């Protein structure tokens, strides 16, 4: 029976491959060769945010695009004011190891995680004026990698136990568990319609889940190594993933197919974080080789390098209004690029 | 414009207070020395940690010679470690507790050590090698049932090193076996690494009163070498 199961699984896999081939027609690069090239983009550093003691893994820009949060292995959840370079808050974490940071759209809640398997949620607007743990979410098993806020009451969190769980801060329960991955899921991104999201695991797969029904609508594959960076396109029908094999892809949700590979021969270091701009021509991707790259999403051509960092760039975040981008590396420095 | 002025002054005062608190924490963060324990599944990590506590992550705090150390023992995680091992780059030393009596998992332990030594974020960290379960190794070698040569074919063409320092109550066969394991680890240690990180072999048992001093000497030598390379003294 197992042999028959494997045979029919292969049959369905090659049927899906045949469907993809039938929906190929032509490549995007061939039909988009008439676009005027953007050319060199010279982005300088505006303000350097230096108040951290250890490496930085996670940051998230605010909805107001004025203030941002940062992570550090010392145990700090500092909230910075990018315009003035003023630290408005400094949250001492119970567990020194944090890898995820989320800023609620309401502006009152800030999330954190780490190896403690706890998605602690901190509230800001309090009568006493001091930050505190709003809720201590527990139930995961693996290392906590990326958490994001659906709203003031629900968050989607990815852990190292190959599952993504949607929580309810008010009641502290796992409403739905998305159990479809083989390896460690690391990065997840939220669509602008806040009903679908894509998650990237260490099995070179990207899965588009349905928030309400709690099932995997479709899966995307085509990378060679583990993917740890993912981000929705602003329109909501595309998303880019950055693997460890020095390649950046762009899968479209509707067609279930790869569009381009953003890679070069001279690049041998893996991608860490990716973040689209507010238009689409700008696809920013972090890198291990002490710098950042700025790709063009419609021509797969390099345009501009955000060099000026030491160690590994471990995060990447573009403001909602697109005015600037922040790249934090392991040297405990956050740099604002205009 | 008064509202903007007082808001700016309040932000400046809050920033100053945050700077003061961060400096006070900075006086503490560098004082502690971070440590990490790695090894096989049945390696004596928690045993050593619990034994020297008297003197997910299972932390421990202890101070010797007026400086304190922090040891990290992750046990609430899975067995895939290629993603959460990057978090421990800024760690003073890595303690590699290894099984020495069960030779079946010795190959897995050597592969684990090879992955750590050649890792492209852990190539700076010095590794402390704890050959745990020495008493059980002595009991097993003296029994003779295990046939250590079966698991390692090239053990037969091996003799004790000239610089061996056996304890007075030991046996040539057991000291040969333990130094064989030590050299099997060191050949992987020596094969790569251009002086950036150093491996120190140490024969330790779980219930040992001098386990802290071994870590002290290892960390002192590692930091001394790092400082010498940092200075012009190389």
């Amino acid at each position, epitope marked *: 029976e197992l042999d028959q199961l*494997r045979q029919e699984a292969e049959q369905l*896999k090659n049927q899906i491959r045949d469907a993809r081939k039938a929906c190929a027609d032509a490549t995007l690069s061939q039909i988009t060769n008439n676009i005027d090239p953007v050319g060199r983009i010279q982005m300088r550093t505006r303000r350097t945010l230096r108040g951290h003691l250890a490496k930085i893994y996670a940051m998230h820009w605010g909805t107001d695009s004025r203030l941002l949060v940062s992570a550090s292995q010392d145990g700090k959840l500092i909230i910075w004011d990018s315009y003035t370079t003023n630290k408005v808050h400094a949250i001492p974490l119970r567990s020194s190891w944090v890898m995820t940071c989320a800023y609620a759209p309401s502006g009152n809640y800030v999330a954190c995680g780490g190896l403690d398997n706890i998605c602690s949620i901190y509230n800001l607007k309090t009568r006493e004026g001091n930050v505190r743990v709003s809720r201590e979410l527990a139930g995961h098993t693996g290392y906590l990698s990326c958490c994001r806020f659906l709203d003031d009451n629900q968050i989607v969190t990815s852990s190292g136990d190959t599952t993504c769980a949607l929580w309810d801060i008010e009641t502290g329960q796992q409403t739905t568990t998305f159990t479809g991955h*083989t*390896g460690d899921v690391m990065s997840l991104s939220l669509a602008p319609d806040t009903r679908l999201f894509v998650s990237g*695991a*260490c*099995d*070179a797969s990207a899965k588009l889940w349905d928030v309400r029904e709690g099932m995997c609508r479709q899966t995307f*594959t*085509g990378h*060679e*190594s*583990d993917i740890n960076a993912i981000c929705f396109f602003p329109n909501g029908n595309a998303f880019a993933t950055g693997s*460890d*094999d*020095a390649t950046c892809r762009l899968f479209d949700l509707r067609a279930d197919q790869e569009l381009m590979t953003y890679s070069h021969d001279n690049i*041998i270091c*893996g991608i860490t974080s990716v973040s689209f701009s507010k238009s689409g021509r700008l696809l920013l991707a972090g890198y291990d080789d002490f710098n950042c790259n700025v790709w063009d999403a419609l021509k797969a051509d390099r345009a501009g390098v955000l060099a000026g960092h030491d160690n590994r760039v471990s995060c990447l975040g573009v403001t909602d209004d697109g005015m600037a981008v922040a790249t934090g590396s392991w040297d405990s420095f956050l740099k604002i690029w205009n | 414009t008064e509202d903007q002025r007082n808001e700016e002054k309040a932000q400046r005062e809050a920033n100053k207070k945050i700077e003061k608190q961060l400096q006070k924490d900075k006086q503490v963060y560098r004082a502690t020395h971070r440590l990490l324990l790695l090894g096989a599944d049945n390696s004596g990590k928690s045993t050593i940690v619990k034994q020297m506590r008297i003197l997910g992550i299972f932390e421990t705090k202890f101070q010797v010679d007026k400086v304190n150390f922090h040891m990290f023992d992750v046990g609430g995680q*899975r*067995d*895939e*470690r*290629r993603k959460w091992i990057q978090c421990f780059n800024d760690v003073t030393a890595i303690i590699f507790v290894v099984d020495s009596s069960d*030779y079946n998992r*010795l*190959q*897995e332990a050597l*592969n*684990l050590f*090879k*992955s*750590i030594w*050649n*890792n*492209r974020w852990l190539r700076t960290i010095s590794v402390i090698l704890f050959l745990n379960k020495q008493d059980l190794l002595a009991e097993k070698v003296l029994a003779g049932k295990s046939k250590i040569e079966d*698991y*390692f*074919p*090239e053990f037969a063409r091996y003799t004790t090193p000239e610089d061996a320092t056996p304890e007075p109550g030991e046996d040539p066969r057991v000291t040969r076996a333990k130094y064989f394991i030590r050299d099997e680890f060191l050949r992987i240690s020596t094969a*790569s690494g251009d002086g950036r990180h150093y491996c120190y072999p140490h024969f330790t048992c779980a219930v040992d009163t001098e386990n802290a001093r071994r870590i002290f000497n290892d960390c002192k030598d590692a930091i001394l070498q790092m400082n010498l390379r940092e200075y012009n003294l190389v």
Partner: nanobody, 126 residues
Framework: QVQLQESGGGLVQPGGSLRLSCAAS????????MNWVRQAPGKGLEWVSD????????SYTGSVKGRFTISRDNAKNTLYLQMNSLKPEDTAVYYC?????????????????????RGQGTQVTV
């Protein structure tokens, strides 16, 4: 997708020769370092042998030293383990595992949990 299919493997009495062929697709064969892993009945996973990108950095496990012969054909994207002088202890399942990160000499691919980058394995019985 990355697919690792193993070929060969039958019931052979002690002695004889078996040629296990690994079929690799969906990735660049040359860049990645590969290895073989066993799964004996009633026991856990173990590591057999590994070869680097070029193939001149071959290493073997303690259990077998001269009884196996691992080599790669980067042109045809194949990995082989020429085995001879078999023993009854080698009644395991052989998976053609691959280290995740390209252009590196470290990989953690002996995990008991379902490692992504390895095939179902072929049964060899002695």
């Amino acid at each position: 997708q990355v697919q690792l299919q193993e070929s060969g493997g039958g019931l052979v009495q002690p002695g004889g020769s078996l040629r296990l062929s690994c079929a690799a697709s969906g990735f660049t064969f040359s860049n990645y370092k590969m290895n073989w892993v066993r799964q004996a009945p009633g026991k856990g996973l173990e590591w057999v042998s590994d070869i680097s990108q070029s193939g001149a950095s071959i290493s073997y496990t303690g259990s077998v030293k001269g009884r196996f012969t691992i080599s790669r054909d980067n042109a045809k994207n194949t990995l082989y383990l020429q085995m001879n002088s078999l023993k009854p202890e080698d009644t395991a399942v052989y998976y053609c595992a691959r280290c995740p990160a390209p252009f590196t000499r470290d990989c953690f691919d002996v995990t008991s949990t379902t490692y992504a980058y390895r095939g179902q394995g072929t049964q060899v019985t002695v």
